[PDB]
Amino acid sequence: GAMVVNCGHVTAYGPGLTHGVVNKPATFTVNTKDAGEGGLSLAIEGPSKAEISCTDNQDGTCSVSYLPVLPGDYSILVKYNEQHVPGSPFTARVTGDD
Known part of the structure; x- marks a missing residue:
């Protein structure tokens, strides 16, 4: 580790x-x-889709903002220069309220 x-x-x-x-x-x-300064990219999968926005800030991040609209296992695909990252994929388990 x-x-x-x-x-x-x-x-x-x-x-x-x-x-x-x-x-x-x-x-x-x-x-x-x-x-x-940036240049990496994402894709998100699941039962349903999202808008995958971001924010530049002044803190050096590429801060990601998306919106799950139906409950599910939302699989993040992170890429750095056309190929996936060392820990990809990830899986956001979205819980519901209605």
Whole structure:
């Protein structure tokens, strides 16, 4: 196992890779810390689809924002330069309220 002092050039983390909330915005964080200013990409699968928005900020992240509209096992596909990341895929288990 790794430590916090030796992490990779580009990472994806947060509760939005592993859980969800139907009809309220689901989010997680990505960080191109030695990879660059950005340029990575995503795709999301499941029983249903999402809009996969993002925000630039001033903190160096590529902050991802999506919206699950039906309860399900929403599979994140992270890619870095045309191929998948070292920990891909991920699966956001979205729970419902109605």
